Symmetry: C2
Subunit: 299 residues, 2 copies
Amino acid sequence: GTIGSMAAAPQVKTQAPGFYRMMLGDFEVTALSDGTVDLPVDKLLNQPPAKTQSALAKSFLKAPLETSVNAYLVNTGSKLVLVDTGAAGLFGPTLGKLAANLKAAGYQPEQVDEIYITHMHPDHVGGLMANEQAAFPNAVVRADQKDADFWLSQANLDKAPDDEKGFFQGAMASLNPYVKAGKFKPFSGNTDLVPGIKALASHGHTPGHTTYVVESKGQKLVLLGDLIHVAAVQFDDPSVTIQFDSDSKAAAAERKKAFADAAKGGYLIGAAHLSFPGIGHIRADGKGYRFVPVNYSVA
Amino acid sequence: GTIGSMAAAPQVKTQAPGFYRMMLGDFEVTALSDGTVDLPVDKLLNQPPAKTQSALAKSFLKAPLETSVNAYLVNTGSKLVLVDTGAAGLFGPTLGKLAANLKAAGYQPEQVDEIYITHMHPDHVGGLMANEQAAFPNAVVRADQKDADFWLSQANLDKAPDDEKGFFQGAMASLNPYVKAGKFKPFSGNTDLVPGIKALASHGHTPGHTTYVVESKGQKLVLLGDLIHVAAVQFDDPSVTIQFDSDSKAAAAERKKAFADAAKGGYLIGAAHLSFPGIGHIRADGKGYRFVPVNYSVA
Ligand SMILES: [Mg+2]
Ligand SMILES: [Zn+2]
Ligand SMILES: [Zn+2]
Ligand SMILES: [Zn+2]
Ligand SMILES: [Zn+2]
């Protein structure tokens, strides 16, 4: 210890760098942490708090629930693509770790060729911008036209209630460097993006919410964005929606489709708000689903 | 491409540092990865390969199975203690990562006060020695007297079949610096070690296999060593044993007792061969058990 064996070295406390490497056929996937943030999931989920409390207890959890914010880097061998970008400073002092974690993972933001945005919530697009400038100076940003039409519209910002105006302001501030520079390239619905990566519409959580399907050599990873927020509730009961959903009915429907398809297909998913790295399989489990986190692997 | 187009970015491939920080009351726990190693679990498990193949498929796995090798650092404030040490180079080129991961975690070997060994298999004690020297030059090493007297006895080496002689050679070489320097301190069965950490006999896997029970401010973590090897088989069916067990009957009995106790108590377990970081809760699930990995947390 510091003093004989009577006093240990001080506790270091800090977490390991938030990146996780996973091969997927010929492709290299790097899950990137933006950090975590506590969520009042009792208030946010669209069911009685008592039910949320019972469900959290089953999983040895309590509200407020420390919730991951993840993004996913894909190096296809010919392109470097990033799926989502975290919050930068749009959502409190515990997020915005992605820039540091990308560097820790061995890449620089100049190397990113394209960025695919699941949806234009602040915890997905915030990381696009630092000091009025593009954080990724060479990237083309792609998102669904229905999200661009909704979140980048001054009319919508103007009629939004005061506590929602921030989400539009954040989207505009985040996507503007790219739009001005001719590096925002929308798509409409299901779209081939770069070989091995496709946009799959999963509209509901937002109007243009998009899933990204990544596949190489028979190995498939479906990046689901915000089709789930609270694993301890919404695997067992996928019908439970959340206040953050623009269209709760559509959001539930999309989640159920995605879970059913993953169960049937036996492929990996990655989800922005599953515990970091947020990657795993899904199996059916009666009326709900069971998440099977990916086995730890090292090259 | 256009003039001076750069080649596409090569894949980095290297994994993030294998450490995971977790607070346990006043104590800081650092799970340390020694790497992974593939195991032919279809052959090693004491049931027909078909049943193992079926179980693995259910969890989207297949043999050979990439198996984590974990150790656990605990900073109690008055002591820095390390539970197991990985393999160094005793079990191939994919292990022995503990030393680098300890450094990444913010500690040096010379800071470690005591080392508690669950059992003297190579993948638990190899990390004690480098260059015929103590890798941890201030530490007292502790293990069950029954394990010391089994593995560190020349008669048992010389009776062992050729393919098992390595385990005794490795144990002897790993412990020798400490034994020579008077820094190996055995215990016999259930023992208080330092405030907040106790040895709990869990004999079977080896003659002196020991569980370490860590507790602070009502928060308990039970470090189970090798009570489990193949989560995808042995949680659903704790009766299935493995060729690595010295006494398979006792091993199965100890595994069942520990799972039942953890389910009842609702406390955390950490296990050497559960996917890194190997920390979670256990709940009863019909005739077997379900592991609930800890939620990703960042200070
Ligand atoms: Mg289930
Ligand atoms: Zn969202
Ligand atoms: Zn989100
Ligand atoms: Zn063992
Ligand atoms: Zn072992």
